[PDB]
Structure formats: structure tokens, C-alpha cells
Amino acid sequence: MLRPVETPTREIKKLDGLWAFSLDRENCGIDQRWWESALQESRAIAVPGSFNDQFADADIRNYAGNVWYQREVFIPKGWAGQRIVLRFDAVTHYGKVWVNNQEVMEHQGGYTPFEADVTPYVIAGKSVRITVCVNNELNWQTIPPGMVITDENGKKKQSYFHDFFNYAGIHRSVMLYTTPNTWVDDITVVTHVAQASVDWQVVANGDVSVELRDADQQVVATGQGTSGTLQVVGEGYLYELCVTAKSQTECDIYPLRVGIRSVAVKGEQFLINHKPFYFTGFGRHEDADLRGKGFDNVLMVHDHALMDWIGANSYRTSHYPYAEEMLDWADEHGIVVIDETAAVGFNLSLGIGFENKPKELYSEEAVNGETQQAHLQAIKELIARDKNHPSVVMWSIANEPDTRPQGAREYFAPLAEATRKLDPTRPITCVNVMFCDAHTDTISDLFDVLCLNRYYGWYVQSGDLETAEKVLEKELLAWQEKLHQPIIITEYGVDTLAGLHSMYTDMWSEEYQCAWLDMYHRVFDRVSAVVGEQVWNFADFATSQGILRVGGNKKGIFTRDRKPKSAAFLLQKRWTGMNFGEKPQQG
Amino acid sequence: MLRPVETPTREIKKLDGLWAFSLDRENCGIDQRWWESALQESRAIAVPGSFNDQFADADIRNYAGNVWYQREVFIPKGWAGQRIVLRFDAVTHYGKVWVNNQEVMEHQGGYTPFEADVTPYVIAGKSVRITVCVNNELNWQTIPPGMVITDENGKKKQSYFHDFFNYAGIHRSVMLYTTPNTWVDDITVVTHVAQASVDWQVVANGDVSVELRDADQQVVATGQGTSGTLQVVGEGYLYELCVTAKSQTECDIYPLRVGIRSVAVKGEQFLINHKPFYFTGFGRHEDADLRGKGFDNVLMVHDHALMDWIGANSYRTSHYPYAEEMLDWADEHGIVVIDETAAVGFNLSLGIGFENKPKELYSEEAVNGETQQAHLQAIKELIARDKNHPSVVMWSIANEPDTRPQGAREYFAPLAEATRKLDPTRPITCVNVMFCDAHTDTISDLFDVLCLNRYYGWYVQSGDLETAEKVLEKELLAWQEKLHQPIIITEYGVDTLAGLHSMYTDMWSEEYQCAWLDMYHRVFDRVSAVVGEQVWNFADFATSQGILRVGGNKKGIFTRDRKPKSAAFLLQKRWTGMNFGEKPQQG
């Protein structure tokens, strides 16, 4: 499965915004089969957006259970001789959908599309009732995991183990799509460099021809057959190889953009086209002021303008798969992307407070075999749909897992190996949490380049930069000599509320963010193996409520409404001072 | 008159803090001679402090009229054979005081001490009732001027024409002081340099000897007689010449600290000891979070620590005489000080809004002959008590007067000339307001070095730095060629609320403060005659309420509680980058 693009392939975008929405507090929907009649006592909701914060209501915001969307649609008239298929680009956590009293789809996965042919349940020209049942619950076999808890009164409350807030709803595009009656499924392409080759595979209903055209889209070379190899002689050139499906009586044309993408890892260097690289940029989040994680074109354009100004050339889709629009953008603009799945919270050592969670991390009570297989499904879907993007430069299996407990490597080994089985073109990482240090972590052996999320001077060095530097440097050198891999610091940052200034350079002040980030920068400058720096969050984002979070995680370089803290000008001076992709040497 | 210093001269500081305080809303005090009995229905007040904000009450804060202080004191026992005299170091606007049913003092002037012998109304060992009547009203014969307005109901409301808020009360030290029965009044010293001479004058009751001792206080030379001359062979050396009064039967010793102070103005240079200088620093204010203008040692130590860190070597006592403690401090620490009197608001062209003020500035209705003589008294008192301070480097007659109307120079000429008559040792200035530009101002001819308060890019160039630079530079060159004087930019700054960040570098944001101040700095770098830069306010301060002021004037480099905005690090980088007293040349 890959993204619908239009040519003699058509669609009616159904991000019509306003659907009928209703909560299901007493779980009556399935039994009264609500999809059967117009929702009783509904309210208007926006459909590219989370349902949590759109109504300024704490009881919808913290709601756990089943919610219901509904929307009627007229199917276009020129589709009577076509297959009508219905695609949701992201339903966060779980979705099941009924096209007029007949059930059509079901899917467990919050950041990946799922589609299904409904041509035998539609006829072009008339109006059908679409009803969606969305679930936002997490158990130990979900990606990410969690524990629902039902109190004395029967009220559900969801507990989880990741920082960001558990936003849910229809966060991305809904889509009615038609394609000619022979070509259905997937295409895959792989690219090589010689210090200039390709490959093709199409799955459709008949003969296939493929022609690579360039940005002027004049044909630069053509083959036809499911496989073989053509050759050819800040932001990146994207050719376009146009694959055609000659068969039955109708032809089908699909355009797939390809970039000359190359890379594996070599010793201590993350090369690109046989070129050393330094990652600069951010751990991101899909989080905005009123839409939750809902995608929005304005926000995307503005935050790319911000990363462009600040000099970042890369980022990482922190803790879940992102809106594909962003990877198409990264394609055209030459942004380097670390693709991560929703597998966060595999750790019960991070929660901090005054408050019964399972005692053995890897076991049947928690992360079991079912968990490992749901995980492998998540990696499967992320690779299945982002495989042809040039901007995806590395896969990341999970984020900050607890690898101290027994059973950790028995769990993660088949996943690393299987993912290498899923695509050998790009490297494999697993971002490492602070407390599984160099002397302790179990799984770093299995990955190509190890990524570190370290916060010396914040969570563990009590605001004392002068010792934090020393600790961070030992640990740096230790990691490299233990694995002689490239080191990408994927998370590093401190909570700072915009407006707090202090002569004493204290924690939470803007001066402290500046000083802390630049001391980290000084040690980066001095160790061979660090090939990347991505600060911990570009903007402030929302989290669940707790004594550690003042209205959200304030570790951002920008505020939630995208206004710059002082450190935004620190980074801008450093990241645009170096030349592109090259690390500042030691002074 | 000069400050009491203790040796065989004694005192009991009466900043005992808590006095009895009462408002007099229906003007009953004088007629019921309240000083006669303990105040009826009083509340505790602090006496180094303004009465306005100490009670968190809007009706005391905006009160106009008469207020009453009271406090009983036991006179020390070892004073029975002495003159007991009572000194208030500052009663803001007007004060009259009764020592136990007998009236002893009266004074019109808010920032200068006034004292009086009350030895025949006291006897050592017993307790006396001190009652003070403090008035906070301004008319056109006050320094500064104003207009009280009585509405339909008989309620007074005070109108004035200066930015800062009209704080009042006992703002500085109260003091019981004793000195031996021969020496009463003044001493004056004058110092010269030869690319090393002095003079003396004592007024007392009998023969005088004087001996100059140095910081090790070993006598370095001695004379005796009211006059003559001795000679000798970042922060400044302060000798100490100890003047003694030999007479009657009792001797009296007064210690007066002297600094080798030198300077007049030469062409386009403000020399010091025949050395070109660049003023750096601030226009200040006496304004803090709960004391109003009340002096406080902690605040003084901290804000000197801030000016020291930031690299400022100078400041100007904006719009009234300061606490003498600060000029003693500036003495020991080598801070250069522009001494200004309370003569602000001689201008009716500055108020901006939607709201009957007199039509002719210089005339009998407003600033008349009585006004000119009250003014000359104010200059008289400021020079009379700050004449021997080395840190005072220049007198400033007034701040931002309206010189366009007819009669302006007829008013200001006898004042400039008279002040030059009051002390020829230090130069004379009159800070100039924006709208009396180089082609218009009437009085700049009469002063030694002209000081400019300019705000291009804020009040008159609508937030457009790129035109503001050009305007400011023409006007610069124009001023110099018109007078070939040194130019000290005494005010330049913009309102910026800490916390407002903006990618667009808009007005009120911290980025705009940084950009604006540094563009001003670029033009300063390029014009010969500017010999000084003092930004408009070090910290945010309170003003009266209006649509132009958000909780006060936000033009400060620091917030009112002394926290640094981003520009505090801009200035610190520039003012400590140059060497001391030398201007950065053009790049």
C-alpha cells in the first residue's frame, strides 16, 4: 500500500471537516448498532484533528472508551464504472468503520493508513452514511502500551508510560479513492550509488511498463517488466519514474518520485552518497494548540520555515509515524528523517512521583509474545508505506526501552533481525534511555548506529553544568569504544518557560537553556563518534498532568504557538555557522 | 549644609521604620493642630519608603492632599550639653514638622535634605512627639510642576507632565544629629590637575585647621585657615582631608572625602584628567516593587552589582536628586554621575491621548517668575549639598523642556548663567527632547555639552529601523556642526515586555529591543561628536495610568524585580568589549 496520487486515478477528499460526533460513555454503540441510524444527540467535529481539545471540555478531553463519527457522502457520478475504495490516512489507536449498515473496515494502529474496496457497497451518484468507531485505549498488546484501570465505580481511566498526551480521534486525511480496474497494490524501488543504479517491482493485474523521467520529465530511461536495473549519468534532486500498467482494456498510470538514495554505515561515519554527515535538527512532535495531533498545512509550512531559518537539516519523527505529507516535503526539500514507530513506553523505570504497576517488565503480565507480534506489525506497516521515500534515512525500532530486566534481548533480537529482513537499504537504530548507560545496556549490539537521549545536568546532575560536562564526556568515550559506532544524540534539552530570566543561570531560565545546550555542544565538538545532534523538541507540547510538567513539556526551543526562546538564536548561530553536513571541529 | 558623618559628632538614626500614619482627607489637621495629640485612628507605616504602595490600597495610592506622620523618641542622655538638631534627608514634595506642639521646620523640595536646631525644644533623656505633615501636590511653581484639579464634588485629582508616577512620603533618612557647640555649617573644596592642587573654605565658630590624609590616612599635607592650596605628587582614588575646628573650649572634627577631580569640556571631547571619555550606562530611577522611591541598601548593592556586571561606568540621576548614599558609592567606586534636578515636565507637547491645559507655556498662567525662582532654589539646593562629591561630573538644569514657545530662552538664560555662578568646576547641560530638533531648539547655545533623548524607530518612525537609522544619523551630524559640542545620548530605549518573542522582530518584543539598540550603536560608532550613551532605563518603573503604559514604563533593560531581558546581554557584550572610557571605532 502507498499514498494515492491523482492522474487518471481519482479521489474526493473527505476531510470535509464537520462530521457528526458523539461519545459512547455507557458502551451502547455496537449493541444498538449505531451505524444503522443517524447519531442520536451529536455535535459537530472537525476531521483533520484530535477530538480531545476541540470542545474546551475536560470530560471529553480525559475521556476513555468508544467515540463515534458519522458523515454522509454523495459518490461522484463518473465512477459508476470503477472500484470505489475508502482510505483513512490515520485513525489514532483503533478504528472500525461501517458504510451504510455494512461493516467494511477495522484497524489497530494510530499512525498508519488503512483502506478497503467498497465498490460492491456503493453506487455512484447517491449518498451513503459513513460511521466510524474510534477507540483510544492502551493495553500491553498495543503500540504504544498502557494499562486501563477501572475504579470502584466502573469508570475507566487510562494509564500509559510515555511523555506526550494520549490524543486520539481522526487525526489525518479521510479519502475516497478510485483507480482503474486492473492495478491495485504496491510498488517498490531501490537505489544505488558508485562512489547510479535502480530496481523495480510492481504488483497489479497485468503487464507493466516503467519509464524514469527527470525533473523536466523527459524520459531518461525505460524498461518494462516487474524487475531489472536502469542507470543514470541543501535540498535534493528527485527524479520521477512513471510506472504504467498495460492490461485488460484499461491502462493505469502511477507516478512515483524517486531520489538517488544510497546509504549504509561505515565504521564511525554516517555516510551519505559516500559522504560523512552531521545530523542537525530536532526531535519533533505532532502537537498544536487546538487540533491536538491533527495535521494542518499551515503548521507544516511554518515549522519548516522555522527549521529552515534555524539551520536544521534533519529531524526525527519522535515516537510515532508522522503525516506522510511531511516526508513528501522532506523529499522535495532534502530533509534527512529518522523514521520511528509508535513503540514508546516499554519502560517502567521512568515514571517519577509519590504513587501498582507490573513488577517484571518482560513477562506474560506485560510485554509478552502478543506484544512482540503487534510490535512487528507496527514496524511492518511503517516500512510498508514509507519504503520508497528518499527522505527516510534510517528506521528506529523503539524509543527509550528498559533493557535492564531479564528477557529484553530475547524480545528485541527477532525484531531487529526481522526489520533488517524488511528493508536492508537503510540502517537500523533503537534510541537509548539515560539509565541504560554504556556499562548496562543489553541490546545496543544489534543496531547499526546507536542513538542516545541524555539529560545530564537536568534529571540527574541537579543543575550543575560543571560536573554534567565531565559525566557526559566519559560516557561518550565509553559508548564509542564499547561499540565503535556513530553516535547520534537524538534527545538533549531542558524545560525552560519562555520569560523566566535569571542572573544566576538557574534551571528553568532561558539563560540555563542556552548555557546547557552549548556546553553539550562543546563536548560534541571533542568526540570522534558523535555524527548527529537533534535537540529535545522544537516546540513545547502537551503531556498528561503531573507535578513534573507545567502545562506540558516545556523543553521546546519554541513555545507551543511557535515563538522563539533565546536558545533559538543560539542554535541558529551554530547550525548555520558550520558548513552543510560537516561537523564543527574542536577549537 | 552637607551630610552628617560621625566621629566626635553623633546621631540617632530615626529610620525606626514604623511611625503612626494617617491621611487627612477633609483637611482637619492644621486647624485641629493634630501635632498636639497622638494621631487619631492611625496605621503603621515604614519611614524609609513611599506611602503610596505600602498598603495595597488604591485610595491611599492615588490620594492627593495632606498626610500625617508621628513618632515619639527618647533623646540620648549624653547629649544634655549639646545642640540637638533634627534632619530629614528627603521629604518628597513638601514637609512641615512639629517637635511637641512647637513648630520647628518647613520645606518645599522633594529630594533635598532640610534640617533645624531644636536644642531649645528638647532635653536629653526624655521622649518627644515628632509630627510631620507631608504634601504631594504640584502647581506651576513647584519642582516639578503640575496642576491640581478639583472636580464637581470637591475631590482633588493631581495632573502632572512627567512619565514616572508621583510617589510621595518620607522617602529617605530621618536623623537626629548632634555636633559640638562651635561648628555648624558648610565646607567647600575644589581640585585641579596639571596634565595637582586644591582649595578649602570652612564656615564655623572659630579657628580652623585642615589636614589632607590619604587612604592609609597618614597626613600628606596640612594647612590651617579658611583658604589656600595644597599640592600632591575603573574606580577612583579618594583622599580624605580631615578639617578640624579649633575654638571656644570644644574642638570639632569633620572628615570630608575628596577625589582628584578635574574636568571642563574641550572642543568635541568630554575629557577627564585631560583624557577623552565615553559615557556608558543608564538613565536610572528611584523605583522599586513595594517601597516606591524609598531608598534601600539591598537594592543599591544589587543594582550596582548589575551595572558593574553589564559594564556601565556611568549613569544619570534621572529627573530628581538621588539618595546621597548613591553618590558616596559612586565616589568610592568611580562611577561617573550626571546630576539632574527635579525640573521635569516643562513641556505640554508630550502628552498623547484622547483628552484643558494652558495654551502658552511660558507665561503667568504657567511657568512664571515665581516658577523661575523656585527653579533656581532647586538648583541651589542640589549644588549646595552635592558640591564636594568627585562623582558628580556635570550638572543638568532640566529634562526635556519645551523650547519652541516664546519666552523659553528668556526663562532659561538666567538659570544657566546663575548655575555657572553656583559652581564653575563642572560643566552644564540641559537634556533635549525629541521634537526640539537641531533646526528648532532655542537654548542649546547656553550649555557646555548637549544631551539628546532620541527615540527614532519608536514614537516617530513607526517601528521601521531602516529609515530610523538614516533620520537619526542626519540629525546627529546636524547637531554637531550646529554646535561642535560633545553629544551624550542621554535617553534611548524602547518598551519591551519580558517574555514577548517574535520571529518578525516587531515592536515590544525582546528581539526588537536588541536590534534597535544595536542599530543606534552602529550610528554612534560613526559620528565624531557622540561621547556618551546611556540607555533609557535600567529597570522598568511605575508611571501614572494611561493607554501608552502597560503597568508602567517597560523601557527597562531589567524588569522591575531586576531580572534581565535579552538586551542586557547585548549591552554587556558591547560595554565590556571596548576598553574602559574609550569609544568603539567604526568597522
Ligand SMILES: CCC[C@@H]1NC[C@@H](O)[C@H](O)[C@H]1C(=O)O
Ligand atoms: C529522561 C527521559 C527523558 C524523556 N525522553 C523521552 C521523551 O519522550 C521525553 O519527552 C523526554 C522528557 O522527559 O522530556
Ligand SMILES: CCC[C@@H]1NC[C@@H](O)[C@H](O)[C@H]1C(=O)O
Ligand atoms: C519622547 C519622550 C520620551 C520620554 N523622555 C523622558 C523620560 O522621562 C520618559 O521616561 C521618556 C519615555 O517616554 O519613556
